[PDB]
Design a protein around this nucleic acid. Structure first.
Lengths: 388, 388
DNA sequence: TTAATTTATAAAATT
DNA sequence: AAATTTTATAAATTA
DNA sequence: TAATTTATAAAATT
DNA sequence: AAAAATTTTATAAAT
C-alpha cells in the first residue's frame, strides 16, 4: 500500500529490506491465483506459499516473522494476529520436526503389543489380545494425531467421517468435530498403522471370536448414541484415565522405555499438532492441507485398495458403512502378513477365518515380502515359535 | 533396428508391446543426450533413465527386464548381460528398500556405544571409550556401506579420498579401490553418523589422551605402508575376525537385540549394495550416482561446514590432510552436542579441551536443539547423571 | 508452607 | 461366579 | 555331518 | 621399564 512504505523506515535497514524482498515474492506469487488489503493475508495463502516452495519450506522463520509483522503492522485484531502466529509456529514444527527419532518408540511397542505371546508380563490386563489392541490403538492414535486424552474420550465414532477419494488417490478417517484430526493407513508398515490396529480390534470387539469372546454385536451401533473408539467396562464409555495410566507404564517397562504420563495423556508441544477449524479436494482433506496429514501420519497418501473379501458386515446404516468398508480394506489387505508373523493371534481362532477360502487367501500371495519386516521383529523381547 | 522388429514377433503380443513402448520412451529420451547400436545400452544410460523418472523409479522392474531382453536379444556377451542384470536388481533394492525398519537397530546401538557409563555391562572390553568407538565405527561403517568384513580389512586409509565439492555442495569420504563405497556426514544425527564416530575415534587414536594413555602420534602416517581404518593390537593391521565376532554379540545382548554374524561379517543381500567399477560432478561422486549415496547413507547431501577450530593437525602430507580437515569439520561441528549429552566422555578429559576457549564454545551455541535428540537417548539401558 | 498431580492401596459394581 | 474396571482415597511425587 | 557359531587353552604384544 | 592383560593364535566344543 502507498501508506505502508513509510512504516518500514521505522525498522532496522537490513530487516526492513528482507521484508521488502519477501513481500515482493509473496505478492508476485499471489499474482498466480484468482483473487487487496488484509484478505491478502490469511492462513490459507501464507501456508500454501510456504509449503509449496522448498526454498522457503526449509527456512520458514524469517518469512513467518515478516508476515506477523505485515499483519499487525496493518489493522488486524491482536488476538487474531496471535492465532495466526500460533498456526505459523505449528506449521514450522511440522515441517522441520524430524520424526526419525521418535519412531523407534512406536515400533518398539507396536510390535511387542501385537505379539500374542508375551511371557514376560504377568500382568492381568493384556491377558487377551483385545486388551493389547485396545491400548495400542489408543497410543498409536495419540502418536499419530497428537491429541489430548479427555478429547480422545470426547469423540463419538458416529462423528467419524470416512475419506474415500479415488479421484485424488486418498483414504482415511477424519473428524471435523471438536478434536480436529485425520488418520491415514500405512500399508508399508501395517503393525505401526493405527487403523489396521483398529480393524483387528474392532473385529474382536464386534464380531467377537466364537467359542471364546462374545462380540458386542454390531446391532448396538443403532440403539446407542455415543460409541467410544475404545470401550471400557461399559459399552457406551471410553475407559477411565487412571486405568490407562496403569496399562501404560506396564507396557513401557516390558519394552524397557522410559515413561512420562504427560506425553500420552496431554498434548505434547515439542510435537506437531493439527490446526483447528470453526469431503475433500486435491490439496486438502477435511479442513487440512495434505502435507499436514502425510507428515503427522508419516506416510504418503494412497487410494483405498479394493479387496473382494468381507470380514466386516456389508449391511449397515449408510453413515458407518463407508468406515467399516475402509477397515475391511485395510484388515483384509494386511491380514496375510499378520498370519505369517503371528499365526497364534486371537483373530485366527475364529472359525470364520477357518473356512477353506479364508485359509486360501491367508495362504496366498504376501502383501509385501517378509524381508521388509525383519527389523521390526528384531525389536521385541519374546521370540515366538517362528524365528526369522 | 531394421532386423530387430522380427524378434518381437517371437514373444507374447502383450509383452512384445510393453517392450515396444518402453523402447520408444527410452530412445525418445536419449535424443536428449549427445550420442551406433550396443553402445547405446550401457548401465550408465539405463540407470540414469530409470532413476531420473519418478514414474519408472516407482516401478523399475518391467523396464529392467525389457532391457535385459533387448540386450541379450542382440549380441551382447552372456556374463556381461548377467552383470547388467546384477546392477539393475541392485538398483531396484536400492530404490525400493525401506530403511524405516532396519533403523532402530543402528540407533538403539550407537547411542549406547557412545554412552561413557555402562553399568548394565560388566564386560572388560569396551571399558575405554576407544573400544566402544572402534566397534561402533565398524558397525556404522558396514550399516552404511554394506561391505564384507574381509574387504573392510583390505582398505588402507591412504586409499581414501576426501570429496569436498562446494560448487555442488557435497562432502564425504570415498573409495574407488577394491571395495567401492562413499560415506557422508549425517549432521542431523551425529551419533548415528559414522564419520563423526571416526572423528572422535581418531582423535582418541592419534592425539591420544594426556595423562591416561599414549598418543599413537600423527607421524606414523608416513612411515607405515598400510593404515587400517581401525587398529587391533598391531599398529598396521585391522583387528582379527574372531575378536570383532566376540565384541558384537556382547554389545547386542547388552542392547537386547538379536544377533546374526552373517549380517555384519558378510554381504547382506536383502540389503542394498554399491556398484562395482573397473573427483565427482553434479550428479555422481566417485563412479556413483548421488541417489545411491544419499539413500545408503540415509542423509541428504551437503557442503562441508567451515570451522574456525582445529583439533586435528593443520600440518601433514597433502594426501591425508583433506581427509582430516573433513574429520575436523564434523568433529568440531557436533562436539558441543556430545558435551551436552555425555560430558563424562573420555575426549573431554584431554587438557587441550580444557582451554579457556575450547570450553568457551563447547558451552556456546548448540548445533541442533536437544529436544531433537530426546528419542535417541530414550533407547539406552543406562541413564546417566544428566537426565532429559 | 498451599497447590496441583502422578502413583500407590481398598472396598464396590458390572460386565 | 471371578475378577478388575471403576470409584474412592491416601501417599508421594512437585510446583 | 556338512558347516557355521561358540566356547576354552597356551601364546605373544601392547 | 617390567609386569598386566587381552588380542591373539590355536583348538575343542556345540549349535
Amino acid at each position: 500500500m502507498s501508506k505502508l512504505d513509510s512504516l518500514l523506515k521505522e525498522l532496522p535497514t537490513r530487516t526492513a529490506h528482507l521484508y521488502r524482498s519477501i513481500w515482493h515474492k509473496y505478492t508476485e506469487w499471489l499474482k498466480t491465483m484468482p483473487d487487496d488489503l488484509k484478505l491478502f493475508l490469511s492462513q490459507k495463502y501464507i501456508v500454501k506459499y510456504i509449503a509449496s516452495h522448498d526454498d522457503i519450506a526449509k527456512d520458514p522463520l524469517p518469512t513467518c516473522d515478516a508476515m506477523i509483522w505485515f499483519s499487525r503492522a496493518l489493522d488486524i485484531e491482536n488476538n487474531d494476529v496471535l492465532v495466526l502466529q500460533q498456526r505459523l509456529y505449528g506449521l514450522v514444527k511440522l515441517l522441520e520436526f524430524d520424526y526419525s527419532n521418535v519412531i523407534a518408540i512406536l515400533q518398539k511397542i507396536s510390535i511387542n503389543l501385537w505379539n500374542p505371546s508375551t511371557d514376560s508380563l504377568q500382568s492381568k490386563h493384556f491377558k487377551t489380545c483385545q486388551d493389547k489392541l485396545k491400548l495400542l490403538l489408543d497410543f498409536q492414535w495419540k502418536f499419530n494425531t497428537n491429541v489430548s486424552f479427555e478429547d480422545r474420550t470426547t469423540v463419538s465414532l458416529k462423528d467419524l467421517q470416512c475419506i474415500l477419494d479415488d479421484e485424488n488417490g486418498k483414504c482415511g478417517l477424519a473428524h471435523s468435530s471438536k478434536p480436529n484430526f485425520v488418520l491415514v493407513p500405512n500399508f508399508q508398515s501395517p503393525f505401526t498403522c493405527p487403523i489396521f490396529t483398529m480393524a483387528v480390534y474392532y473385529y474382536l470387539r464386534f464380531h467377537g471370536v466364537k467359542k471364546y469372546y462374545k462380540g458386542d454385536g454390531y446391532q448396538i451401533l443403532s440403539q446407542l448414541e455415543h460409541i467410544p473408539i475404545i470401550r471400557g467396562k461399559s459399552l457406551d464409555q471410553y475407559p477411565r484415565e487412571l486405568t490407562l495410566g496403569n496399562w501404560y507404564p506396564t507396557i513401557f517397562k516390558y519394552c524397557q522405555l522410559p515413561y512420562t504420563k504427560k506425553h500420552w495423556f496431554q498434548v505434547n508441544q515439542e510435537w506437531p499438532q493439527f490446526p483447528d477449524f470453526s469431503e475433500s479436494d486435491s490439496e486438502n482433506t477435511i479442513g487440512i492441507p495434505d502435507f499436514y496429514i502425510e507428515k503427522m501420519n508419516r506416510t504418503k497418501l494412497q487410494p483405498c485398495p479394493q479387496v473382494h473379501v468381507h470380514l466386516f458386515p456389508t449391511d449397515l446404516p449408510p453413515d458407518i458403512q463407508a468406515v467399516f468398508d475402509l477397515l475391511n480394506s485395510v484388515l483384509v489387505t494386511s491380514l496375510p502378513l499378520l498370519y505369517r508373523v503371528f499365526p497364534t493371534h486371537d483373530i485366527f481362532l475364529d472359525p470364520s477365518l477357518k473356512t477353506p477360502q479364508n485359509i486360501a487367501f491367508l495362504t496366498g500371495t504376501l502383501p509385501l515380502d517378509i524381508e521388509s519386516q525383519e527389523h521390526l521383529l528384531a525389536q521385541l523381547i519374546d521370540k515366538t515359535g517362528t524365528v526369522s
